[PDB]
Design an enzyme around this catalytic site. Structure first.
Site, short mmCIF file in Angstrom:
data_model
loop_
_atom_site.label_atom_id
_atom_site.label_comp_id
_atom_site.label_asym_id
_atom_site.label_seq_id
_atom_site.Cartn_x
_atom_site.Cartn_y
_atom_site.Cartn_z
N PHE A 27 24.04 -16.22 19.84
CA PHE A 27 22.71 -15.71 19.73
C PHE A 27 22.47 -14.37 19.07
CE2 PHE A 27 22.92 -18.73 23.21
CZ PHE A 27 21.93 -19.63 22.88
N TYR A 81 23.92 -20.29 14.86
CA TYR A 81 22.80 -20.27 13.88
C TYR A 81 23.19 -20.94 12.54
CZ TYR A 81 20.48 -16.70 16.79
OH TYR A 81 19.79 -16.13 17.84
N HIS A 103 17.39 -24.84 26.64
CA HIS A 103 17.82 -23.90 25.62
C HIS A 103 16.62 -23.07 25.11
CE1 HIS A 103 19.43 -22.80 21.62
NE2 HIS A 103 20.64 -23.09 22.05
N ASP A 139 25.60 -24.32 19.52
CA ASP A 139 26.30 -24.19 18.25
C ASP A 139 25.73 -22.95 17.51
OD1 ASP A 139 25.49 -27.23 18.89
OD2 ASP A 139 27.34 -27.39 17.65
O1 LIG Z 1 22.93 -22.64 20.87
C1 LIG Z 1 22.81 -21.70 20.04
N1 LIG Z 1 21.68 -21.57 19.32
C2 LIG Z 1 21.54 -20.54 18.50
C3 LIG Z 1 22.55 -19.65 18.38
F1 LIG Z 1 22.50 -18.60 17.60
C4 LIG Z 1 23.79 -19.79 19.12
O2 LIG Z 1 24.69 -18.91 18.96
N2 LIG Z 1 23.83 -20.83 19.94
CL LIG Z 2 16.90 -20.27 16.45
#
Ligand SMILES: O=c1[nH]cc(F)c(=O)[nH]1
Ligand SMILES: [Cl-]
Length: 224
Positions: free
Chosen positions: A78, A67, A188, A65
């Site tokens: 990310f 930030y 993750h 998901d």
């Molecule tokens: O799983 C996620 N963590 C952090 C993030 F920024 C993202 O886009 N996805």
């Molecule tokens: Cl983070």
């Protein structure tokens, strides 16, 4: 609004099967606003990953998901704006694995746009989130849109590697069961999961060897 006004044309074609779902999400989000609950990333960035060409995706990165902190999410999973410091911890961790795997210097900033321009789709399973509330838009309808996107990538049967980071991996692998599609998973890169299998996973060089194995060209991962 037709999808062709929100996404790149190849993506509009691939996602036309969930076009009503995408409209229901826009209704949902505007409803949240009317109720005083914001969402991230910006409305124009929600479908940003689908603005780079469908037909050019060779690596699919899928996180969970966006930030949750205002000023971070930009619609490419990310990634952050080039002026953002400190980097979020998930991104810092991706960049340590990037230097360990590839031997490249640390990147100058946290803008992953060059990856997106080179055929890496930076997708999340869920495309919006409420500020300060991780994973708060889970179960709200994005899963049907992102499942359509992934299956439609796999149905091209062009060489594709999916890098699956975190808890959606076992759900997403069956969606990638097709000719010329390989899915590689790890924990993750967030603070408390990264040291449990993210680090040491070498997803950048692995993706490139899997591509070359299929006769595809490797990704130039190098950031400025
Ligand atoms: O799983 C996620 N963590 C952090 C993030 F920024 C993202 O886009 N996805
Ligand atoms: Cl983070």
């Amino acid at each position: 609004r037709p999808l062709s006004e929100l996404v790149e044309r190849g993506w509009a074609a691939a996602l036309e099967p969930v076009a009503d779902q995408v409209a229901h999400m826009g209704q949902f989000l505007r409803a949240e606003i009317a109720a005083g609950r914001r969402y991230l990333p910006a409305g124009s960035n929600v479908l940003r990953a689908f603005t780079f060409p469908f037909d050019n995706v060779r690596v699919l990165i899928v996180g969970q998901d966006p930030y949750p902190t205002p000023g971070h999410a930009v619609g490419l999973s990310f990634s952050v704006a080039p002026d953002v410091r400190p980097w979020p911890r998930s991104l810092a961790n991706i960049f340590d694995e990037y230097t360990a795997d590839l031997g490249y210097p640390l990147p100058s900033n946290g803008d992953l746009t060059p990856w997106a321009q080179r055929g890496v789709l930076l997708l999340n399973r869920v495309l919006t989130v409420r500020p300060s509330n991780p994973a708060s838009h889970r179960g709200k309808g994005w899963e049907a849109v992102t499942e359509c996107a992934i299956r439609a990538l796999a149905a091209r049967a062009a060489p594709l590697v999916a890098i699956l980071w975190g808890r959606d991996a076992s759900t997403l692998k069956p969606m990638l069961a097709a000719g010329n599609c390989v899915a590689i998973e790890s924990p993750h890169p967030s603070p408390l999961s990264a040291s449990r299998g993210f680090f040491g996973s070498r997803p950048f060089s692995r993706a490139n060897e899997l591509l070359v194995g299929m006769g595809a060209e490797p990704i130039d991962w190098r950031l400025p």
